[PDB]
Amino acid sequence: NKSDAAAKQIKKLEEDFDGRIGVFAIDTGSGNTFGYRSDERFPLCSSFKGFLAAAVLERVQQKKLDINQKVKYESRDLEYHSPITTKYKGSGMTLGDMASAALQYSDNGATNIIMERFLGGPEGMTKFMRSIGDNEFRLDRWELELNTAIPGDKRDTSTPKAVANSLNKLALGNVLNAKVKAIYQNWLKGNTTGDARIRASVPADWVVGDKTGSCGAYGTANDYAVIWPKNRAPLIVSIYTTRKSKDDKHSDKTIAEASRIAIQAID
């Protein structure tokens, strides 16, 4: 029951704003799940950066990279929206700080520098997702070209379910060891851009770790998070949305609401 009602509510929500909503929630304590357009592709936008941070932590775990190694780029022209990397451009930053900047601030310079020097570009990032059993994830382009969010384009997309499952494996699973996983979880908890999305759909006492994505085109925005309820097991929620017109702006409120419904469907 509670599921068919939740799906009805989601259907109404996408009609109202004339867009498309993809949802996938997992109650890790019971295995119960809820999905709506969960196997459909949606642009990743900058949300893929939450997985980029994890890939870096894996290289650190395998001791291929040091989390404290200095990354210099003083002569590099920083991409649009590099709030953190531009302020440390003269002194450089540790690999760890840059990776979290990429996640918590959606820093584009951090992202592209890490992808060009450590992860092997969009192919490498996609190779990492394959390594953890994700066969839906695909990153074809770099920031910021990956944000075009053109309808029907499969480049730089994934499905809400694949994102939910990968986030589960990484944040709660065993891909990263206890120590590195603890770092990752806290980087997510420290995200500074998702206050109006999934974080707004839960009681203030619940802890949320997330990574947002806002393409800036076709009203495409999204958010995925690990929710730690008070007195309960973690919940994984993945919300992805797109709109019909290129000039349509995204809707945080629709995302927070879709989030509220999804959480009720797996209660």
Give yes or no for a contact between 19 and 255, defined as CB atoms under 8 angstroms apart. no
- Residue 42: partners with Cβ closer than 8 Å, 6 or more residues away: 20, 22, 157, 158, 159, 160, 220, 222, 240, 241, 242
Active site residue 116: no
Give yes or no for a contact between 171 and 83, defined as CB atoms under 8 angstroms apart. no
Given the residues 15, 116, 123, 145, the one annotated as active site: 145
At how many Å resolution was this determined? 2.1
Chain centroid to CA 155: 16
Give yes or no for a contact between 20 and 42, defined as CB atoms under 8 angstroms apart. yes
CA distance 35 to 30: 15
CA distance 111 to 33: 31
Ligand-binding site membership of 108 (annotated): yes
Give yes or no for a contact between 228 and 206, defined as CB atoms under 8 angstroms apart. yes
Classified by CATH at the fold level, domain 1-267 comes out as Beta-lactamase (3.40.710)
Residue 31 β-bridge partners:
none
Sign, CA dihedral 199-202-206-210, equals negative
First to last CA, the chain: 12
Residue 11 β-bridge partners:
none
CA distance 156 to 138: 5
Residue 241 β-bridge partners:
21, 221
Given the residues 38, 46, 100, 201, the one annotated as active site: 46
- Domain definitions of the chain by residue range: 1-267
- Site of tokens 């003083």: 74
SS (H, E, C) the chain: CHHHHHHHHHHHHHHHCCEEEEEEEEECCCCCEEEECCCCCEECHHHHHHHHHHHHHHHHHCCCCCCCCEECCCCCCCCCCCHHHHHCCCCCEEHHHHHHHHHHCCCHHHHHHHHHHCCCHHHHHHHHHHHCCCCCCCCCCCCCHHHHCCCCCCCCEECHHHHHHHHHHHHCCCCCCHHHHHHHHHHHHCCCCCCCCHHHHCCCCCEEEEEEEECCCCCCEEEEEEEECCCCCCEEEEEEEEECCCCCCCCHHHHHHHHHHHHHHCC
Comparing CA positions, the residue from 261, 66, 40, 48 lying closest to residue 166 is 48
Ligand-binding site membership of 259 (annotated): no
Active site residue 3: no
